[PDB]
Design a protein around this ligand. Structure first.
Ligand SMILES: O=C(O)COc1c(C(=O)O)sc(-c2ccccc2)c1Br
Length: 297
């Protein structure tokens, strides 16, 4: 039902119970590679690991492990790589993964420092003149430009495979005002930011999967991906009522643990999708409305 369901859940105020049921039903696969002693320093959180079956393997002989999951949505025909915020020792692996998986876009939904603590290494360069070289993976990364808005920033980077001397443009979409364990300001703020990613071409089938991360790579990242997938699904069918959000989330959780972290995050997903349906179904206007409502200037 979607909008009828949302308002049935609001009416009773049963969002916690709906969310817990999803947690109850969720898939549980081994994360044996992630739990190997030699990988302990490659994981940011003890209890957030990628399942062996869907994990991204680095193309080296030495240690192919990264805390990263491929979310391959078959019906939707879109994939995402959900990963944790890279650590000081895994920034090289991060860019290796981006290179090997032919990703064009990186979506970052967290701040480097949140609530006094460092949720993510400084993995991209903050100034044109001070490029980064990742010696372990032989990659160079250069800030090409940045367009700073009120609550989000878009950065052009150039990624270079130092071995082959091939270079790629990576688009970096940094949402700076999404609180950990929280939700965006409004559906408008969120949708405005999602459509920026969309409009960049980063989600094209002709590219590798977009890399999405926050700190753990499941809460805010899960929320972002659910909404995008639900919108794509109804887009393909031009049929909002054919989307079962909880069923999509459950499908998503086959590929990485714990996607969406609070009941309110789930409630926001419903919100964002219901509002986003307006554009999908032929309302040009709402895109301009979101932009205004988001106060991006
Ligand atoms: O993305 C979010 O909303 C919350 O993400 C986060 C964390 C953070 O950003 O500090 S810690 C965390 C978490 C870590 C271990 C177990 C269960 C949850 C998650 Br999940």
């Amino acid at each position: 039902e979607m909008e009828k369901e949302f308002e049935q859940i609001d009416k009773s105020g049963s969002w916690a119970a709906i969310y817990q049921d999803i947690r109850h039903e969720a898939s549980d696969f081994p994360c044996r590679v992630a739990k190997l002693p030699k990988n302990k320093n490659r994981n940011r959180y003890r209890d957030v690991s990628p399942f062996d079956h869907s994990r991204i393997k680095l193309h080296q002989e030495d240690n192919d492990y990264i805390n990263a999951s491929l979310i391959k949505m078959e019906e939707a025909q879109r994939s995402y790589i959900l990963t944790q915020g890279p650590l000081p020792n895994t920034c090289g692996h991060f860019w290796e993964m981006v290179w090997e998986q032919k990703s064009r876009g990186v979506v970052m939904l967290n701040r480097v420092m949140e609530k006094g603590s460092l949720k993510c290494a400084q993995y991209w360069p903050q100034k044109e003149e001070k490029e980064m070289i990742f010696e372990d993976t032989n990659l160079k990364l250069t800030l090409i430009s940045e367009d700073i808005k009120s609550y989000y920033t878009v950065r052009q980077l150039e990624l270079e495979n130092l071995t082959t001397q091939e270079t790629r443009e990576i688009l970096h979409f940094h949402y700076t005002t999404w609180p950990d364990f929280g939700v965006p300001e409004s559906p408008a703020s969120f949708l405005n930011f999602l459509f920026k990613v969309r409009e960049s071409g980063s989600l094209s089938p002709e590219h590798g999967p977009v890399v999405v991360h926050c700190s753990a790579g499941i809460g805010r990242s899960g929320t972002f991906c659910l909404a995008d997938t639900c919108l794509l699904l109804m887009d393909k069918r031009k049929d909002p009522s054919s989307v079962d959000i909880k069923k999509v989330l459950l499908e998503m959780r086959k590929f990485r643990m714990g996607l969406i972290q609070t009941a309110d995050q789930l409630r926001f997903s419903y919100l964002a999708v219901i509002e986003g349906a307006k554009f999908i179904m032929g309302d040009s206007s709402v895109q301009d409305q979101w932009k205004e409502l988001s106060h991006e200037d």
